[PDB]
Ligand binder design. Structure first.
Ligand SMILES: [Zn+2]
Ligand SMILES: [Zn+2]
Ligand SMILES: [Zn+2]
Ligand SMILES: [Zn+2]
Ligand SMILES: [Zn+2]
Ligand SMILES: [Zn+2]
Lengths: 228, 228, 228
């Protein structure tokens, strides 16, 4: 069939595994069969490695995400990222990925192609964040989240000069979630920068976009300072 | 292999599922593999739908039966009908299907081809009965059972002019089962018509086939009157 | 992939089944998929017979071993023999198979091709021993073990004329295990012959190979006498 259904099938299999309905061998067999039905041989080999017991579910998910990045499948990428962020107990990251998926789905139905590369760099940053979390190395997580906040700042700067309004709300929600994450990680300056960007986006959405440029430059200067 | 081996394998898998030995994912994987081994692609997609959790076992069985009717596989049809009538708690309908299957196996080893279309029509009627039962609509069940009784009346009329004797006993047993079904459904007139046909068949089998016809047209007018 | 990784994958699947991690349907599906991935169709049909419930795991292992003997896969043969001797509660035979596979692995990395045929004959003898045990027929087990001891005697006679030293230790350990097996089987003469051969091997390894030959012919005539 089409690549959209394939992602739905794989996602349903992974949710069945996560909820406890099926086990690892059943999940491996089902996902390998699904991938083989669509002709994806590399993904089938990666799942075969799980079927042999060499790797675990999280490692298989990481390798599947890398392979899908090489191939260029988007819905499968979002499904795999949500599964990765659900295997690790982080509901906030899953919420961020869900909002980004909604943004991507809104973007693909129109001619906006400049945002797609953004939405993609941010997916790479999210993948690096997940990898760093899996390594239990908390120092790189903050820098990667700072890069994510900078990317969202660039996207909101692009969006303000246009007439979009739902994009502003979604970026505000994402930035609020990241600020909460920063607060839960024992950091205050990066959380303050994220809340500054969120406040600037809120001001721009409200109608007073003249006050937003000073907030934007202050926030970007602070973010650049804190990364180094 | 041959179409007879496939039916036995699928039936065995379904009994393993029904007895509680295997679960739904294992059953889906096994049955899809069996169908793929024999080159039946459409049945494989139908089972794939179950593997994704879109449909249940009963809906999958119904779709498999429809696909096998389109293809023309008989033993698979009988296996699927028995499974359908076993998932719904109706041993009597399973007994009717078993007797029909024995009749079909007896007929195929000889040159009798006229009984084949009648058995196919009765299989269609039984499929509609199962569908109506799944819909919990009790009004159409009685009408469909009346049509089934009329078809058995036609077959017994055909068989009496011939020398068949086991067919007479099997039709008598089937008619008794339908009479019990009608009695358990809170109906008395249709049960009386079914018992009238059974009595006519028994009289013809005994040797007094002169008295059978009066009963025969009496039962047929009663059945025609009760359908409308 | 290569035939070495296939044996590892199959052995891992069977180990998972034996340890209780997976059940018979999961093992059947996994092993059939593994054999299908490498293009081994006959092994796939043999596993299919297990998927349908016609045969059990032990019978499936026996048929797979016979088919691999016909095909000429050695690592798969060792894996299947180990699984067979693990399903039957016999750790000593598993130890014998492990030592034999170590000897085979040592031999295949050099130019020694004469030991390969003798190891093949001993593998046939061990397969016959497993078959006889599965039949609960104890009298043939002793004669087959006598033939195995004679084959080990031939190998030790060949190896003494060469400079091999680890081979002598391995045959000594194997002969000690067979002697323990004979003692546990309520036999003393065959156990005495096995211990005689082991003592001759130990004497030859120590450096006094002049006294080994007398023990050698004594043990071989005793073994020939006891078989008849
Ligand atoms: Zn595979
Ligand atoms: Zn503060
Ligand atoms: Zn499929
Ligand atoms: Zn009455
Ligand atoms: Zn197969
Ligand atoms: Zn003694």
């Amino acid at each position: 069939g089409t690549m959209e259904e394939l992602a739905r099938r794989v996602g349903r299999a992974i949710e069945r595994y996560l909820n406890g309905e099926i086990n690892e061998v059943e999940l491996a067999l089902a996902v390998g069969h699904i991938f083989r039905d669509y002709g994806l041989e590399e993904l089938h080999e990666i799942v075969d490695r799980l079927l042999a017991g060499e790797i675990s579910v999280l490692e298989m998910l990481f390798r599947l995400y890398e392979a899908a990045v090489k191939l260029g499948l988007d819905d499968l990428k979002f499904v795999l990222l949500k599964a990765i962020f659900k295997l690790l107990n982080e509901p906030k990251m899953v919420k961020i990925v869900e909002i980004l998926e909604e943004m991507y789905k809104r973007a693909v139905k129109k001619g906006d192609e400049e945002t797609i590369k953004l939405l993609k760099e941010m997916l790479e940053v999210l993948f690096e964040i997940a990898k760093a979390i899996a390594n239990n190395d908390k120092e790189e997580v903050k820098k990667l989240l700072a890069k994510f906040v900078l990317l969202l700042l660039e996207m909101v700067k692009r969006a303000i000069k246009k007439g979009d309004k739902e994009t502003l709300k979604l970026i505000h929600e994402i930035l609020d979630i990241i600020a909460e994450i920063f607060e839960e990680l024992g950091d205050d300056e990066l959380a303050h920068a994220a809340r500054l960007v969120s406040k600037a986006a809120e001001l721009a959405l409200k109608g007073k976009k003249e006050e937003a440029e000073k907030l934007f430059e202050i926030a970007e200067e602070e973010l650049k300072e804190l990364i180094e």
